[PDB]
């Protein structure tokens, strides 16, 4: 549970090799910091470059290793915003082809577009699975699964126990969103914890909570 001084960044621990990163904008977004024997892996970066830089520098210093990869969960500014920083420092920015094309169309530098519907990644000792469940918060939103701990990073497809709204539904697919959440529940039937795009960590109850919000 290491927070910065002023800047708006904090890092909470869950496992011996998994932490949560939260950054303020008017809404505090979440992400993941995975400590592996080959380097640090992030599930999402931050709102912009300035925040993304501070974030990388904070964890590299703490864990004594380099951030080598980042997985972008969708193309919105809050997730793709620090792409320039990632690209110039040589950090691999993974994403689906869809997320990659949406970032470009919106004027952002593009991530790798290497991820499929189900992609199995392995970082030294760590194993990470990416999964596209269908449209919801956006047309491209994906979730991240850590099998070794049964942890799920839901991104903005999943709302926390504090969200009484669906948020910005401008690029959302409110109809398929319920089916997409069901795809996640069907694929991962035993979840230990769930990390929402915004809000506090939870469990399977976050998905059911999102389903109710979609009614």
Between residues 137 and 209, which has the closer beta carbon with respect to Zn ion? 137
Contact residues toward Zn ion (CB under 5 A) are: 76, 156
76 is in an annotated binding site: yes
Q: Which of 106, 168, 175, 192 is catalytic?
A: 168
Q: Which of 17, 48, 69, 76 is catalytic?
A: 76
Is 21 in the active site? no
Is 76 in the active site? yes
Between residues 76 and 209, which has the closer beta carbon with respect to Zn ion? 76
To Zn ion, the closest distance from the beta carbon of 74 in angstroms equals: 5
Q: Which of 44, 48, 78, 140 is catalytic?
A: 78
Q: Which of 21, 137, 141, 209 is catalytic?
A: 137
21 is in an annotated binding site: no
Is 137 in the active site? yes
Among candidate residues 105, 47, 76, 72, the one with its CA nearest the CA of residue 169: 76
Is 74 in the active site? yes
Is 78 in the active site? yes
209 is in an annotated binding site: no
To Zn ion, the closest distance from the beta carbon of 175 in angstroms equals: 17
Q: Which position's Cβ is nearest Zn ion?
A: 76
Contact 37, 20 (CB under 8 A): no
Which run of H or E residues covers position 102?
helix 97-105
Name the pairing type of β-strands 18-23 and 92-94: unpaired
Q: What is the rounded CA–CA span in Å between residue 125 and residue 38? A: 8
State the burial class of residue 23 (Cβ atoms within 10 Å of its Cβ: 0-12, 13-18, 19+).
buried
To Zn ion, the closest distance from the beta carbon of 139 in angstroms equals: 11
Q: What is the rounded CA–CA span in Å between residue 109 and residue 128? A: 24
Place of tokens 């230990």: 192
Start-to-end Cα distance in the chain: 36
198 is in an annotated binding site: yes
As beta bridge partners, residue 42 has 33, 70
- Binding-site positions: 74, 76, 78, 137, 156, 159, 168, 198
Q: Which residues are annotated binding-site positions for substrate?
A: 159, 168
- Tell me the catalytic residues: 74, 76, 78, 137, 168
């Amino acid at each position: 549970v290491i927070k910065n001084e002023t800047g708006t960044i904090s890092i909470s621990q869950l496992n011996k090799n998994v932490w949560v990163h939260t950054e303020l904008g008017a809404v505090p977004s979440n992400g993941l910091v995975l400590n592996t024997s080959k380097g640090l892996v992030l599930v999402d970066s931050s709102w912009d470059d300035k925040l993304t830089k501070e974030l990388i520098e904070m964890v590299e210093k703490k864990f004594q290793k380099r951030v080598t990869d980042v997985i972008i969960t969708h193309a919105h500014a809050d997730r793709i915003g620090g792409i320039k920083t990632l690209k110039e420092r040589g950090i691999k920015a993974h994403s689906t082809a869809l997320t990659a094309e949406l970032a470009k169309k919106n004027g952002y530098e593009e991530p790798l577009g290497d991820l499929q519907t189900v992609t199995n990644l392995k970082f030294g000792n760590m194993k990470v699975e990416t999964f596209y469940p269908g449209k919801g918060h956006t047309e491209d939103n994906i979730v991240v699964w850590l099998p070794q701990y049964n942890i799920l990073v839901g991104g903005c497809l999943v709302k926390s126990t504090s969200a009484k709204d669906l948020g910005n539904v401008a690029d959302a697919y409110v109809n398929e969103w319920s089916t997409s959440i069901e795809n996640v529940l069907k694929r991962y039937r035993n979840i230990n914890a769930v990390v929402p795009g915004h809000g506090e960590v939870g469990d399977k109850g976050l998905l059911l909570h999102t389903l109710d919000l979609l009614k």
